[PDB]
Ligand code: HEM
Ligand code: HEM
């Protein structure tokens with residue numbers, strides 16, 4: 009362990025945000041994906057009507 | 063020298079024709095074509111009756127692809143019916159330039 | 169040229185849509201969507217996998233072929249002579 | 250002729266609040282929209298952090 | 299003294315079959331070598347084979363056995 | 366145009382190369398890369414800068430400095446990896462942007478394509494030097510041969526190598542030069558990008574169906590911006606996860622030892638994408654003829670648009686082309702792993718096996734495909 | 745009948761975009777002060793006695 013830590017003094021800390029980011033992380037993704045869909049909603053809701061008087 | 067195999071040719075044709083999704087999107091063969099110069103002026107010479115109808119199906123087509131839905135199979139295009147309407151116009155533009163192309167050689 | 173104005177010429181098409189508020193972000197996204205996932209996945213998997221097989225085969229094929237070829241010096245020539 | 254046109258139903262993608270044909274849509278409209286925005290704003294707090 | 303957990307955990311896995319199984323091969327090598335060792339033969343190649351899976355067993359056990 | 370605030374500086378009217386630039390309706394997340402590519406790069410510049418801020422290029426200094434970086438420098442550990450690992454991500458971002466082009470035949474646009482061609486060639490050497498900068502054991506030896514490689518020129522190479530060296534060996538000035546090169550070089554690319562883009566505004570993007578999209582367009586801002594934003598956000602974790610929890614995964618180079626010209630590594634490999642070329646490099650026993658291939662390897666991309674064989678651009682409707690298309694995909698990835706192998710006899714054969722296949726896939730098969738299929742539909 | 749907080753909220757805050765913007769910073773502030781404070785416990789809950797925070801008490805100021 010001693011050497012293993014020596015080459016990586018940052019290590020036991022570097023997981024803090026590693027943890028910290030993941031908690032944060034799941035929040036945003038759907039929100040966008042929703043808003044994404046929310047905007048796109050009007051797009052995929054289109055309806056065509058081809059009524060040439062023709 | 064092919065007679066029965068000629069009959070045997072059409073299956074894979076019909077098969078291969080059925081192996082490309084645009085049959086299942088309600089397209090035809092002609093509207094599939096990649097553009098070209100002959101393609102261009104060919105468009106000019108079309109009557110609207112086709113032309114407009116050419117338009118809508120395309121416009122119809124694209125929308126579906128947006129939503130990842132394939133046309134209900136009942137309504138898929140049929141290997142029995144393919145409209146060649148493009149080409150009888152196409153051969154004109156091909157032909158004429160070949161002259162100019164050649165007649166300007168010498 | 170001017171991007172939205174002059175592109176094509178189109179007549180007698182009609183279009184209908186709603187405020188995005190008027191509707192839902194997931195109209196049966198789970199239930200109704202899952203089949204659509206499935207149906208089209210096969211159209212590809214027909215034409216997708218077959219090579220991936222080949223490598224992994226050859227991958228291990230050569231791997232083994234590599235191993236014994238190397239691994240064992242007294243394999244064919246054993247250490248009597 | 251032209252008037253032969255009609256509106257097909259979008260009730261599907263909708264949510265039930267204004268889904269009724271006889272209701273003032275304004276009743277939820279206040280609460281209706283705020284859901285859409287409450288998402289939008291909360292999205293931002295994270296981005297800011 | 300303390301005898302270590304190791305030597306103990308050494309024995310528990312070498313107890314396993316493929317261990318002694320190939321350990322024979324070592325002797326299958328070794329004994330044949332003992333007469334024929336003039337020729338290039340050495341059992342090292344097999345020793346590693348012997349030791350490989352040997353400690354693959356020894357892997358999980360003693361790290362718990364240690365402090 | 367009355368009181369439009371986008372006129373007043375005309376610069377804002379150049380801005381409408383975006384916000385009203387129309388786009389077809391159906392666009393796959395396949396298309397999100399062009400965005401990402403530029404974004405992957407922006408980050409590069411910055412991080413690749415702050416490095417220099419504490420970095421010194423010197424034969425004695427550089428390593429110990431870089432040692433010192435993750436040691437005493439605030440967050441010297443996040444940053445270095447942000448630079449290196451972030452480099453890797455730029456690749457796979459990039460190739461897809463290629464892959465899209467082929468699989469729909471977007472290459473049909475000739476010049477825009479070509480710009481991409483050059484644009485590609487540029488990027489590699491950047492990383493190459495960027496990889497030498499560490500001055501690690503491999504970086505020394507890796508470039509040592511790859512540079513020595515070019516000596517195979519029959520005549521002018523002899524001087525020319527030592528020239529780019531500036532010496533009989535890899536010694537100091539040969540380092541320092543690269544630093545400048547590796548330093549300036551991205552700015553050049555960024556300029557070129559604005560060219561590559563430019564033509565695209567002329568003819569607009571293409572659509573997956575390989576069909577004229579004229580009839581249906583979209584105002585760019587309300588939508589594709591968003592899918593990009595998410596698309597951008599996709600990238601985050603992709604680096605974040607790797608860069609943070611498990612650094613050394615694609616940090617495959619193991620050499621933190623000082624570069625030793627006396628010592629030679631028992632195994633010699635560049636990093637991954639550098640290998641697949643170097644794999645082909647291993648193949649041919651002929652020194653010169655081999656290099657010739659390696660050159661010819663990529664450039665045929667520009668040739669490909671001469672190979673439009675059919676009356677339909679995209680491959681989504683051609684199974685066989687698609688069959689072919691995916692076939693080639695593996696042939697590369699094999700070589701990757703192959704170049705990831707020592708040169709024992711199956712591999713020896715294997716590369717020889719897989720090598721000629723590669724071009725053969727391109728150079729023979731693919732053109733004939735539509736030819737049949739053109740004839741098949743009776744086109 | 746009372747409005748669900750949603751109907752209150754827009755009328756109260758989200759209507760004027762400034763306010764709509766204003767609140768954003770506000771909670772974001774209180775957010776982080778609480779947020780990070782939680783994860784570390786969870787973090788250090790996970791790692792017990794592996795850290796001086798736990799360990800160093802053995803020898804800290806003798
Ligand atoms: C396309 C963008 C870039 C590429 C392909 C690139 C290439 C590389 C690569 C592959 C490394 C090795 C990373 C490592 O060893 O950890 C590196 C390191 C470095 N790069 Fe870049 N880099 C880019 C951006 C930049 C920029 C813009 C600069 C200058 C402002 C820069 C300066 C450096 C420096 C100082 C290092 C030292 C760290 C090291 O070499 O390990 N890089 N570069
Ligand atoms: C750093 C490298 C590159 C960057 C930053 C880059 C950036 C972009 C961007 C932002 C677009 C617009 C998005 C799009 O049209 O889908 C684009 C389009 C394109 N790029 Fe590049 N690209 C790069 C490399 C390449 C290469 C190597 C090629 C080809 C050899 C290439 C060929 C194209 C093509 C054909 C398009 C248009 C595709 C279409 O509209 O269907 N790009 N590129």
Ligand code: FES
Pocket residue numbers: none
């Ligand atoms: S020349 Fe040194 S290995 Fe080929």
